[PDB]
Amino acid sequence: RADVCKHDHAAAYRAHTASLRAKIKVTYGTVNQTVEAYVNGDHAVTIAGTKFIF
Amino acid sequence: STANHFNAYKLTRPYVAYCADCGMGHSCHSPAMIENIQADATDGTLKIQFASQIGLTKTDTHDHTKIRYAEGHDIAEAARSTLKVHSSSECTVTGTMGHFILAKCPPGERISVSFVDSKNEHRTCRIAYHHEQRLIGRERFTVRPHHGIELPCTTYQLTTAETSEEIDMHMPPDIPDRTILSQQSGNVKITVNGRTVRYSSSCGSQAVGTTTTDKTINSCTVDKCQAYVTSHTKWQFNSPFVPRRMQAERKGKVHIPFPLINTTCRVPLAPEALVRSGKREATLSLHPIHPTLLSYRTFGAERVFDEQWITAQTEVTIPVPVEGVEYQWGNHKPQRFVVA
Amino acid sequence: STANHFNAYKLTRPYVAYCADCGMGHSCHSPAMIENIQADATDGTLKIQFASQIGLTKTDTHDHTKIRYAEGHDIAEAARSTLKVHSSSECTVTGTMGHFILAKCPPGERISVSFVDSKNEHRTCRIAYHHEQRLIGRERFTVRPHHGIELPCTTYQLTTAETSEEIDMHMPPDIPDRTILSQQSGNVKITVNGRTVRYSSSCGSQAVGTTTTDKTINSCTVDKCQAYVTSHTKWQFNSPFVPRRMQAERKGKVHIPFPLINTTCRVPLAPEALVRSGKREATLSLHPIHPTLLSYRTFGAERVFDEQWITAQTEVTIPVPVEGVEYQWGNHKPQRFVVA
């Protein structure tokens, strides 16, 4: 192997399934915050009076 | 390694080698054989293996008056400015460590390496080495000064080492010759020698013996004197031309100095832009620079998007869909727009 | 001449040269003229014709140190280290004898001879020559080093001469001028000096009479007088600056140094190929080396004999018919296959 292989390699990642992660600024009425969740449907964005599910 | 480099210099004495192209027609046992051209860097400073001791000391003194290498007598010693990297011209010497010399050279496919401090009219060799400046970004030049470039760069290490990885030098061998001793066919003279000379005759116990001891030899061969090559407290790296006169394969380690670190890069930004915005399509009129790999990639659907090394003062119709383009016409953020 | 080269040197004295290419716009009678170049070489040593006695001492000694040359007075010589050849860079000095000097220059637009002892940091000139090495072989690189192949190449002779080709060491010359005399306004005064002296006055003995010494002529106006300098007992060939209005057309003997012999060349063999054989068609994938020609030629009554600049990592479908083909791509014997 080359000595710069640990210095620099090349990645060949076979693909698995992926997950889109999002962040919604919410003006939840007079609340105005930001929530950032993995968007798979299991995370509950515990808003102030909010249980959002993106 | 490279820290207290006298020990790595002082394990083995340096050794010379029979290069093939060494001065316009010759292959000879120079101390300026390029052992290899090690250029593992985005920064583009070649760390080429010198045939002599890279910063070799004649007493193991790592001082710039002593660039000691393989001579006939053990030190091919010279002035440490006496080297010359000839890529297309005098490439800048950046440092000498162990058995390798690191430095920046001019652009090219063939690099010569010379030493003249005791060097044989500037004893030099010339190998091929495709030193082409494959720099990052669209731009194509070596000019930092208008500070716009902040990119990653694979920089060669500029300091001496501590230990990064050992090239193995040990086991002082020989490689085949015919010219060791002297004799008139029953009157043999064997003296002290600059290499470890085995004592060979055509008959009798003369076959070997790497001593520098005086002896008369009878009852043997007139050309049959095999003054052999060997070593004692020496050894080359791998012996590329370099005959392998060892019985067992072994050596000690040495670090090629300046292990490369992740450095920065100052690549120049290009001229800015022209955006003629008509109907459904934009025209990017750019003036020339040093030449730039400009990319107009349409963001949206199945991506109609192109990119080309543009190299003039020209204009390109970046198609302006409802999705929009990504006009990286140079080294900025490539941000496109909507229809209007 | 070549062996006692001092004989051919001592026959004819060296000359000065009215070279127009002499230092970035000016050009005059410098010693850095170049009479012609010698390109009989697959190896390509430019055999420049030097105006001086480059390779002869100023005392007519065989002085490899003394790079002799000509001023107005005969010995305008320096050390031989002052000779420099710059084509696109400092080319390899090859050999010097008197007026002949061969050497291996790089690629370049004009070869530049430079004498630097009095010619202030290489007083010299750059004559326009296309120094392009037309390399033989299917490949095209300047690589001796690995054992690739031997090729027959007509190389220049690199030894000392005896005689092969007579340079006309003759033509005792003339030249133009205006300045050979002196005179204090009615006393025309000539001295011993470096011009073979004719007088040309409005009238008098500095209008006819010998010029190798001091002569005073009373009652001489300064616009009348003029000292003339011709050549004698030797000369350069046809006087390329050299306005040779000498009346006696006559030649002498000189030998060109090292006429060419059939030498060799270390031909670079490339990586071979990758075969993929289809339905009556073949696809040879070539990985790239330093750039060469690859020629696909059919087997039979005329198959599609085409060449190609093999200059990248690519693939070519040499269509191997039932009659077959010949796949010449590099330095191999080009025998292609048949349908299978």
Kindly determine whether residue A4 and residue B165, on different chains, have CB atoms separated by under 8 Å: no
- Selecting from B25, B86, B128 the residue whose C-beta is nearest the C-beta of C143 gives B128
Question: Which pair of structure tokens corresponds to residue C161?
Answer: 């001469």
Residue in B24, B88, B127 nearest the CB of C145: B127
Could you tell me if B84 and B245 are in contact, meaning their C-beta atoms sit under 8 angstroms apart? no
- Determine whether B167 is exposed, middle or buried from the number of CB atoms within 10 Å of its CB (0-12, 13-18, 19+): buried
* Resolution of this deposited model, Å: 5.3
- Coil, strand, or helix at residue C83? strand
How many interface pairs between B and C have CB atoms less than 8 angstroms apart?
24
Q: Among all residues of chain B, which has the CA nearest to that of C106?
A: B88
Half-sphere exposure of B80 (CA within 13 A, CB side): 19
| Ranges of H-type helices in B267-324 | none
Could you give the count of Cα atoms lying within 13 Å of B250 in the half-sphere of its Cβ? Answer: 4
**Cβ atoms B296, B329 nearer than 8 A:** yes
State the DSSP H helix or E strand holding residue C9, giving kind and residue range, or none if neither: helix C5-11
**Chains with at least 3 CB pairs less than 8 angstroms from chain A:** B
Taking CA atoms, C201 is separated from B57, C86, C220, C265, C294, in Å, by: 73, 45, 8, 63, 73
Contact C92 B127 (CB under 8 A): no
Q: With contacts defined as CB-CB under 8 Å, which chain B residues touch A2?
A: 40
d(CA B190, CA B212) in angstroms, rounded, equals: 8
Residues of C whose CB is below 8 A from B24: 92, 94, 104
- Considering only CA atoms, give the Rg of chain C: 29
Sequence-distant contacts of C67-70: CB under 8 A, at least 24 apart: C67/C96, C67/C115, C68/C9, C68/C14, C69/C14, C69/C31, C69/C115, C70/C13, C70/C14, C70/C15, C70/C16, C70/C31
Do residue B128 and residue C290 have CB atoms under 8 angstroms apart? Answer: yes
The 3-class SS string of B11-33 reads: HCECCCEECCCCCCCCCCEECCC
Within 90-119 of B, beta carbons closer than 8 Å to C belong to 109-110
Longest dimension (CA), chain A: 61
Q: Do B20 and C144 touch (CB under 8 A)?
A: yes
Q: Check: CB of residue B203 under 8 Å from CB of residue B220.
A: yes
How far is residue C93's CA from residue C81's CA, in Å, rounded to a whole number? Answer: 10
C180 near C147, Cβ under 8 Å? no
**Is residue B319 a contact partner of residue B280, using CB atoms and an 8 Å limit?**
yes
Spatial separation of the C-alpha atoms in residues B15 and B12, rounded to whole Å = 9
C293 touches B: beta carbon within 8 Å: no
CB-facing half-sphere around the CA of C118: CA atoms within 13 A: 13
Q: Do C146 and B20 touch (CB under 8 A)?
A: yes
CB C92 within 8 A of CB C43: no
In B, which residues are within 8 Å of C91 by CB distance?
Answer: none
Q: In what order do the strands lie in the sheet with B182-183?
A: B182-183, B188-190, B215-217
Among residues C158, C154, C43, C44, the alpha carbon closest in space to that of C97 is found at C158
Contacts of C146 in chain B (CB under 8 A): 20
Nearest CA in chain A to B39: A4
Structure tokens, C216: 């005073």
* Residues ≥6 apart with Cβ < 8 Å to C110: C21, C87, C126, C127, C128, C129
Nearest CA in chain C to B109: C290
A4 vs B260: CB contact, 8 Å cut-off?
A: yes
* Cβ contacts of B109 on chain C, cutoff 8 Å: 290
**Residue spans of alpha helices (H) in chain B:** 5-11
The chains in contact with chain B, meaning 3 or more Cβ pairs closer than 8 Å, are: A, C
Distance from CA of A5 to the nearest CA of B (A): 10
Instruction: Please report residues of B whose CB lies closer than 8 A to that of A3.
Output: 40, 165
| Distance in angstroms (rounded) separating the CA atoms of residues C49 and C34 | 6
Residues 162-181 of B with CB under 8 A from A: 165
Q: How far is C76 from chain B (nearest CA, A)?
A: 25
In chain B, residues 5-44 whose CB comes closer than 8 Å to chain C: 19-21, 23-25
CB B90 within 8 A of CB B65: no
Spatial CA neighbour of C230 closest among C171, C169, C174, C170: C174
Chains A and C touch each other (3 or more Cβ pairs < 8 A)? no
CA distance C264 to C269: 15
C244: CB partners within 8 A, 6+ apart:
C171, C173, C174, C175, C231, C235, C238
Task: Say which residues have a Cβ less than 8 Å from residue C328's Cβ, sequence separation at least 6.
Answer: C138, C294, C295, C296, C297, C334
Structure tokens at B169: 């030098």
Query: What one-letter code names the amino acid at A30?
Result: T
**Rg of the Cα trace of chain B?**
29
Residue of B nearest to C290 (CA): B109
| Rg of chain A on CA atoms, in Å | 20
What are the Cα distances from residue B118, in Å, to B63, B121, C90, C188, C224? 16, 8, 21, 58, 61
Compute the count of residue pairs across chains A and B with CB atoms less than 8 Å apart.
9
Q: Which residues contact A4 (CB under 8 A, 6 or more apart)?
A: B40, B260
Which are the contacts of B218, defined by CB distance < 8 A and separation ≥ 6? B186, B187, B188, B204
Distance (Å, rounded) from C-alpha C49 to C-alpha C55? Answer: 12
The token pair at A41 is 């449907």
The three-state DSSP-derived secondary structure of chain C is CCCCHHHHHHHCCCCCEECCCCCCCCCCEECCCECCCCCCCCCCCEEEEECCCCCCCCCCCCCCCEECCCCCCCCCCEEHHHEEEECCCECEEEEEECCEEEEECCCCCEEEEEECCCCCCCEEEEEECCCCCCCCCCCCCCCCCCCCCEEEEEECCCCCCCCCCEEECCCCCCCCCCCCCCEECCEEEECCCCCEEEECCCCCCCCCCCECCCEEEECCCCCCCCEEEECCCCCCCCCCCCCCCCCCCCCCEEECCCCCEEEEEECCCCCCCEEEECCCCEEEEECCCCCEEEEEEECCCCCCCECCEECCCEEECCCCCCCCEEEEECCCCCECCCCC
Residue contact B260–A7, C-beta within 8 A: yes
**Rounded to 5 degrees, what are φ and ψ at B8?**
-70, -30
**What is the signed CA dihedral for B70, B74, B77, B82, rounded to 10 degrees?**
0
User: Does B40 lie at the interface with A, CB-CB under 8 angstroms?
Assistant: yes
Longest dimension (CA), chain C: 104
- The experimental method is cryo-EM
Q: Shortest CA distance to B194 belongs to which of B239, B222, B229?
A: B229
Which is nearest to C84 in space by CA: C140, C46, C124, C127? C124
Q: Which residues pair with C34 in a beta bridge?
A: C50
